[PDB]
Design a protein around this ligand. Structure first.
Ligand SMILES: Nc1ncnc2c1ncn2[C@@H]1O[C@H](CO)[C@@H](O)[C@H]1O
Ligand SMILES: Nc1ncnc2c1ncn2[C@@H]1O[C@H](CO)[C@@H](O)[C@H]1O
Ligand SMILES: Nc1ncnc2c1ncn2[C@@H]1O[C@H](CO)[C@@H](O)[C@H]1O
Ligand SMILES: Nc1ncnc2c1ncn2[C@@H]1O[C@H](CO)[C@@H](O)[C@H]1O
Lengths: 292, 292, 292, 292
């Protein structure tokens, strides 16, 4: 009844969850950090007052971010995460039997240490001997090391000039920093912001067009995340083709992933990658490219 | 920043729209009626303080409810609407060159008169000489008249027991009243409530399962409606198959529908009818059947 | 900006405080108990989802309830509190050098234990050897014991019929139970509900009028409590006059009260007891008397 | 239930009124303008999203602003309002039989024209032959004309550097512009912002200390305004004494004011001008003076 967490999604639109408690908090120079216990969505990780991960449905975002990319790869062994302090991207990646090493590269040690203690769903992930945590800006980390990867995962905030993430979505970053760090058959996947019928023009279409300047094959896809009050997007990108059937995705899931996915089967992916009329038109007509 | 319409759309969950004004109110024996002018979604019809339709995205619901059914029919000429006092369903039907008669059978004359007075977008539709407005319970109307239809459209409220709508979702209604009023090769479509990852179990899987007990061919499908903050569902049912490629649907739309759809092309429908893993599972494993 | 406690303090009127956290909860046969940490008002005790006391301004209510009564008495030595489980009333009484015994008679042991555990400001007070805590309905306690008091203090909820408090505001209670338990020259004071320009008619004028039927001298007074968003009232009653200058009150405070009052000096009390035009009129013209 | 007007009083504090409607609006380069129909406070004039005047209680603000000043004057005939577009200050001034001319000088013609049509409580005031409306900055108007007044009334917004009002609260304005425009026995009164136990340090005490540098006799006073969620302040200032009894105020009200005041009698004024301990201490220790 009485305690509420409130979020301004758009200037004109508010989304409010009744609270059981405010469990813990932290803060860093990068962002405020909080963990709420919400009645409709259970525990919820909030960074800078924006909801990031809710207990009841974070599996949707993290399965969709991680699995398509790994499943389109013939044999993905080494993966780098840009972001991922929250730990659930690493969790889903470590469900893959083919994985030897995951590097999580988060800029904010405070998110890592907070989530490692308090998002206990990710506890085995954080303690898995295949995981290396690096506290750095993912752009400097990628630039200063020569190691190559089978999959690189963008789990960053949306591109906002002056914020710490924008540079990790430019054409130059993708071409001159990222692509050289992908092995043959390498696949890049990034979160790509809201992807609703109106909200898709904010960053999703630009992220798509940006990737399209750099990688030969670029597959945008999207899914509803109840707690975000919108459809969310992701984009796969590769110089090897990205075209597998629902059933081949399902066979690889069965063979390579420990436990059953809760959201994603191969049919769900094919649906996800078939965008609606207006969304396809936007992405196809998009001329804007992120630069700097 | 200061004026808000707020609705508790699930318990512990409020969804709030910035308000420009309250344009007109109304009432009937059945419900309170309001037309709000909202900032994020334009003019919004609210019945008993539940949002029904919002000017900026009602095209999504109405294109989805109408066009798949008619497009899957070889030559749909006459169509009966159960409910639909808001007028947009009729608007979308009347875009079809094949259609020579639309009956709108809504139990609430005040809703019809209100929307006729105040929904500018549906003025032409309400005054199309193909449209007959009938004020009656649709169950009674379908029983007492012998006329058959190529397409019957359910534009009613959700089935919750003791509602004025429950009886229009029962096996017996469908078997004994509705089906006998479909012509040979006739198609039924109904709105089917929330279709979100967890909300799809409230009524969508029951409505699907109930129609499965009466029609040979049943195709469920869903789409995000921004102003509802959920995915919403519809269900096609027929004793002839409902099976057309995306390319065939695009052709039929070009040949039969006046002007370009804003939401729906062929690939959009295919995608809509490819449900996600957990939703497909619920539907395929569902046992409840609506009866009284 | 994101976490809020909200209370509908009148119908159609919400008052919302930014929340830092929910510190502790509790419950009893009588009420839900919460200690919130709020931004504008510090720690806030909430009973059945109604704010009782807020750390930053409870001094106002408690100074106002306590000090005028004792200051108008020549030598107040023993005092009985009806209610007061929160502990601040007792805190303020025990500041008086004259006082040798305080009985706190609260019907809810859980409230007392909660506040003893969690209200740091009242720790010393709860452990003052002058204080006796009694767990009982104050009406029953006053009846079954023969001891008389110099001052009796009402720190109860408002009288609304069927409340556990109503009976403690009736003419008969005052006449038959309370007055017989005042020593010669004894003073009663009670909290008297809202005292705002329009809210003063709910209970303040009735409580004043009811006490007028039993005591020769009745002085009503009021002060703004920021966290209540209203003016609040109290009423002094005695069969000896209650009549002291501001200068005399300032002297008595300097000689009898340990440390400086934060809210109340002599001129503040004079001002508090000078009600506004419409409030004085209501009081002077009031006819309702609480009985059962 | 569903439509709400919301106001952030403090960063941490929200105050929300259920709405019947949004009646009219206007806007100017100076401020947004709206008239809401609220359930708890009736019609409400809101400028820049801050509530200014509510139907149920604006009489409190406007009686308190206007009457003390005029009633302490021996024979006030000519009055100048700085602000007053809303019309209620003029209304209350025109209830005085001694008044020959009222000049309302508002910077924003749009407030004047809006309120003249839509705040019909002020309609006789706006049409009274004794009222002259001037559209100007009150500082330029006062500076460029030689006419002197018996009473000058500040009905402006709070002093905020860079806003259009700050200059009308400086020492230099008061000494070199205002005082020369007051006749012998002239009295200045200004609204002086919030005056609550904590909120009084924002502008009230500074406005008091500022006036104290310029006028020999300065009387601060305050009253609760339910719709503002706080105690509001005003300050009288004169080089002739300001010291009348409750009863002399009452006799002058009876003789000179048409109709009965609803809020103010002379006792209410004496109470109003007796500030509480902490408020008096603040005002007396205040060293800050508004300059420029
Ligand atoms: N440049 C960056 N490199 C790595 N992680 C980042 C960067 N910017 C933001 N993040 C992390 O991304 C996550 C999502 O915002 C957060 O954990 C945040 O700390
Ligand atoms: N039994 C019914 N027959 C026809 N229309 C109905 C019935 N019950 C509700 N409606 C209409 O359905 C629409 C959606 O609730 C409303 O316009 C309502 O009037
Ligand atoms: N009849 C009563 N006797 C004593 N205390 C009471 C009674 N009813 C309520 N209270 C106490 O009054 C306080 C204020 O409501 C609470 O602590 C409550 O427990
Ligand atoms: N400098 C000024 N002179 C006159 N009126 C003003 C000035 N600044 C603000 N106002 C008016 O004061 C009123 C209260 O904010 C509004 O009607 C506004 O237009």
């Amino acid at each position: 009844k009485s305690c509420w967490y409130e979020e301004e999604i758009e200037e004109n639109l508010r989304w409010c969850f009744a609270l059981n408690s405010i469990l813990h908090t932290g803060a860093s120079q990068y962002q405020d950090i909080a963990l709420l216990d919400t009645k409709p969505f259970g525990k919820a990780l909030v960074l800078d007052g924006k909801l990031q991960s809710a207990e009841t449905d974070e599996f949707i975002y993290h399965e969709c971010l991680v699995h398509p990319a790994l499943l389109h790869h013939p044999m993905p062994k080494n993966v780098f995460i840009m972001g991922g302090g929250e730990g659930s991207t690493a969790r889903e990646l470590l469900r893959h039997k083919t994985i030897d090493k995951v590097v999580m590269c988060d800029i904010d040690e405070e998110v890592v240490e907070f989530c490692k203690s308090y998002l206990v769903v990710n506890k085995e992930a954080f303690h898995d001997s295949r995981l290396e945590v690096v506290i750095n800006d993912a752009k400097a980390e990628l630039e200063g090391k020569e190691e190559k990867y089978d999959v690189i995962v963008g789990d960053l905030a949306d591109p906002i000039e002056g914020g710490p993430c924008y540079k990790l979505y430019t054409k130059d970053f993708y071409e001159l920093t990222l692509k050289p760090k992908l092995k043959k058959g390498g696949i890049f996947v990034t979160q790509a912001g809201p992807a609703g019928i109106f909200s898709h023009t904010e960053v999703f279409s630009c992220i798509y067009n940006t990737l399209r300047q750099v990688f030969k094959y670029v597959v945008p896809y999207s899914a509803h995340i109840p707690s975000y009050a919108d459809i969310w997007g992701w984009v796969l990108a590769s110089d090897s083709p990205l075209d597998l059937s629902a059933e081949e995705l399902d066979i690889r899931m069965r063979q390579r992933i420990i436990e059953e996915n809760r959201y994603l089967d191969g049919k769900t992916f094919v649906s996800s990658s078939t965008l609606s009329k207006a969304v396809r038109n936007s992405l196809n007509n998009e001329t804007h490219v992120y630069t700097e």
